Write a protein that binds this ligand. Sequence first.
Ligand SMILES: *[C@@H]1O[C@H](CO)[C@@H](O[C@@H]2O[C@H](CO)[C@@H](OC3O[C@H](CO[C@H]4O[C@H](CO[C@H]5O[C@H](CO)[C@@H](O)[C@H](O)[C@@H]5O)[C@@H](O)[C@H](O[C@H]5O[C@H](CO)[C@@H](O)[C@H](O)[C@@H]5O[C@H]5O[C@H](CO)[C@@H](O)[C@H](O)[C@@H]5O)[C@@H]4O)[C@@H](O)[C@H](O[C@H]4O[C@H](CO)[C@@H](O)[C@H](O)[C@@H]4O[C@H]4O[C@H](CO)[C@@H](O)[C@H](O)[C@@H]4O[C@H]4O[C@H](CO)[C@@H](O)[C@H](O)[C@@H]4O)[C@@H]3O)[C@H](O)[C@H]2NC(C)=O)[C@H](O)[C@H]1NC(C)=O
Ligand SMILES: *[C@@H]1O[C@H](CO)[C@@H](O[C@H]2O[C@H](CO)[C@@H](O[C@H]3O[C@H](CO)[C@@H](O)[C@H](O)[C@@H]3O)[C@H](O)[C@H]2NC(C)=O)[C@H](O)[C@H]1NC(C)=O
Ligand SMILES: *[C@@H]1O[C@H](CO)[C@@H](O[C@H]2O[C@H](CO)[C@@H](O)[C@H](O)[C@H]2NC(C)=O)[C@H](O)[C@H]1NC(C)=O
Ligand SMILES: *[C@@H]1O[C@H](CO)[C@@H](O[C@H]2O[C@H](CO)[C@@H](O)[C@H](O)[C@H]2NC(C)=O)[C@H](O)[C@H]1NC(C)=O
Ligand SMILES: *[C@@H]1O[C@H](CO)[C@@H](O)[C@H](O)[C@H]1NC(C)=O
Ligand SMILES: *[C@@H]1O[C@H](CO)[C@@H](O)[C@H](O)[C@H]1NC(C)=O
Ligand SMILES: *[C@@H]1O[C@H](CO)[C@@H](O)[C@H](O)[C@H]1NC(C)=O
Length: 485
Amino acid sequence: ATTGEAYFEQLLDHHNPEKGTFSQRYWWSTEYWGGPGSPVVLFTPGEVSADGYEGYLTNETLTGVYAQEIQGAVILIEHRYWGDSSPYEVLNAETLQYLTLDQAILDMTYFAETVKLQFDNSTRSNAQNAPWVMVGGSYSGALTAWTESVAPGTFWAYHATSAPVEAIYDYWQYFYPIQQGMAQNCSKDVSLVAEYVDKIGKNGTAKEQQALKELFGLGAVEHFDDFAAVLPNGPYLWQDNDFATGYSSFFQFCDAVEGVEAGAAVTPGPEGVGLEKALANYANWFNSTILPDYCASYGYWTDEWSVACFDSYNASSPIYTDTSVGNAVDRQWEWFLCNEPFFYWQDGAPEGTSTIVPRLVSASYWQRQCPLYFPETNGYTYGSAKGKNAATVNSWTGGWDMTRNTTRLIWTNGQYDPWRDSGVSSTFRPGGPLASTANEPVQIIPGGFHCSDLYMADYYANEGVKKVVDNEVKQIKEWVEEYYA
Ligand SMILES: *[C@@H]1O[C@H](CO)[C@@H](O[C@@H]2O[C@H](CO)[C@@H](OC3O[C@H](CO[C@H]4O[C@H](CO[C@H]5O[C@H](CO)[C@@H](O)[C@H](O)[C@@H]5O)[C@@H](O)[C@H](O[C@H]5O[C@H](CO)[C@@H](O)[C@H](O)[C@@H]5O[C@H]5O[C@H](CO)[C@@H](O)[C@H](O)[C@@H]5O)[C@@H]4O)[C@@H](O)[C@H](O[C@H]4O[C@H](CO)[C@@H](O)[C@H](O)[C@@H]4O[C@H]4O[C@H](CO)[C@@H](O)[C@H](O)[C@@H]4O[C@H]4O[C@H](CO)[C@@H](O)[C@H](O)[C@@H]4O)[C@@H]3O)[C@H](O)[C@H]2NC(C)=O)[C@H](O)[C@H]1NC(C)=O
Ligand SMILES: *[C@@H]1O[C@H](CO)[C@@H](O[C@H]2O[C@H](CO)[C@@H](O[C@H]3O[C@H](CO)[C@@H](O)[C@H](O)[C@@H]3O)[C@H](O)[C@H]2NC(C)=O)[C@H](O)[C@H]1NC(C)=O
Ligand SMILES: *[C@@H]1O[C@H](CO)[C@@H](O[C@H]2O[C@H](CO)[C@@H](O)[C@H](O)[C@H]2NC(C)=O)[C@H](O)[C@H]1NC(C)=O
Ligand SMILES: *[C@@H]1O[C@H](CO)[C@@H](O[C@H]2O[C@H](CO)[C@@H](O)[C@H](O)[C@H]2NC(C)=O)[C@H](O)[C@H]1NC(C)=O
Ligand SMILES: *[C@@H]1O[C@H](CO)[C@@H](O)[C@H](O)[C@H]1NC(C)=O
Ligand SMILES: *[C@@H]1O[C@H](CO)[C@@H](O)[C@H](O)[C@H]1NC(C)=O
Ligand SMILES: *[C@@H]1O[C@H](CO)[C@@H](O)[C@H](O)[C@H]1NC(C)=O
């Protein structure tokens, strides 16, 4: 009773049943369940082992809150090819061929119709006889949206928060919301430094380049674009923020760039400190607070001051060659990027557009790594090597244009979510950010980050988030009640 774990026999290839099944881990809770015929909330963590995600079964998360508000069960399902839910122990271009969006979608619908639940083994709790609500954020949010688009008729309702539904090759706009959200002074100074790094990369002497690398403690990094590629570590911490993280790693970064200590009486205004100070501060912040134990955290290395993990040009690096399901880099997600292909390459902005990341960090810098991760094996290669591209995925899914004709799907996006401009509220989406309708609601959380509505800590910290949560819960509750009308 109440909680449990089990294995579901998921179809390897939904288009060829006869190729067989594999074991896929899921967890359940009936804590708020009303009994046979009551609703069910389904959620996958997405691109990660499900270990330590048990919280999504409780009302400390939005999934548990939905369940509580509609008297439903809650099921956490581990995504295929992660954790204990991989059909193969070795992951290369051949074995990864069944890690595709299409498969992942049909997993969800097939599971909802097919699973034999321990808590109700009469089919009264399956999707045929009870309203299932699929919820997700980030990639899992996209999978949720993509399912409503590609495979409607199983789930009663869908909620996708921070969903990158549009595949984008040169996703320089990853950084644009960070640039909008950051302090004026930090934004300006980080920009200065990023542009200076471009300048030295292109038009500097060998000594100037060696010296610049020394400032960051990266004298030993061979390729100048590998060095440039570490600078985004600053802006990347924006993605770790929510409304309950306070003076987080990100805000420490900005303070370091501006050159002040936490709680300083005297701070610079919006003008900032300028290049000379900013560069010094940025380099020292990285050298002293980020570099130590950075490579060691991958497990493949152990020296505190190692720079081995920064080498994107070494084809033998364990980052590329570790084919195991438990690999440290999440090559499973890299597969989706190179194969589907999503790409989502996080780049410096085009000439003529202000950037907070060096232009030397380019789409090409990332695309070069795909064949290192996935060398041709038995004639099998990554999709984008056979000229599959962004348009390939978008034609089929609809991308951010799947919004034309939707049924009981609600969206949430964050004002300053790095993933915003790959989703329906992108400032760069043709027709503009998607206009909310009663049929297809979209809310943008003011000052929001990535999936800021999933954590109930954010509900209590922030009025904006509470507002948004109340609305979307009420919307799911109204839609769910309609099922029984
Ligand atoms: C120019 O450059 C400046 C330098 O970089 C730059 O400055 C800083 O700006 C950033 C951006 O806002 C500041 O960020 C944050 O800081 C907030 C915390 O502040 C206090 O604490 C820090 C750190 O110190 C302490 O803690 C450490 C250990 O953790 C100790 O070692 C230490 O002893 C301290 O206790 C400190 O730096 C701050 O200091 C200043 O402000 C105090 C007043 O509070 C002054 O006394 C002091 O002199 C400092 O100020 C001076 O600078 C300001 C300008 O910033 C001048 O006006 C002033 O005259 C002085 O010169 C504070 O002591 C932190 O809460 C912020 O985070 C919140 O928001 C983010 C973003 O949304 C959320 O992700 C996060 O979860 C958190 O959210 C919550 O609060 C929101 C309300 O803002 C709310 O919407 C949200 O829901 C959530 O709230 C709820 O939770 C709260 C608890 O977390 C709760 O209170 C609330 O009720 C809700 O429950 C953010 O991290 C950064 O601190 C500044 N750094 C400085 C000044 O040193 C400046 O902005 C740039 N300017 C321009 C124009 O570009
Ligand atoms: C920026 O990054 C550098 C590495 O790229 C850091 O360095 C060095 O770090 C330590 C600390 O100085 C040196 O080590 C020694 O530490 C022990 C401490 O007891 C000594 O007993 C012994 O002499 C060690 O050799 C490293 O050797 C040195 N590494 C390299 C490759 O130079 C540097 O500290 C860092 N700068 C900042 C400000 O953090
Ligand atoms: C979140 O869920 C918990 C656990 O179900 C809720 O907790 C408790 O509150 C119930 C309703 O008031 C009580 O009847 C239970 O005795 C109590 N359970 C436990 C284990 O402490 C909690 O209220 C929910 N949070 C909100 C804001 O509704
Ligand atoms: C490229 O990566 C490989 C694999 O990690 C590096 O390999 C090796 O070098 C280490 C550093 O001395 C040795 O300690 C390892 O035993 C060794 N491992 C293997 C599998 O060869 C290699 O040095 C890297 N090459 C460059 C030029 O950096
Ligand atoms: C369903 O569960 C009940 C629980 O007691 C069990 O007795 C019954 O045999 C189960 N039926 C089937 C068909 O598995
Ligand atoms: C480097 O030099 C070229 C040619 O003078 C110039 O047009 C360009 O702006 C410089 N590039 C960078 C990145 O600063
Ligand atoms: C929208 O889709 C529904 C369900 O597939 C369909 O029945 C309806 O006719 C469509 N409407 C439009 C305007 O395309």
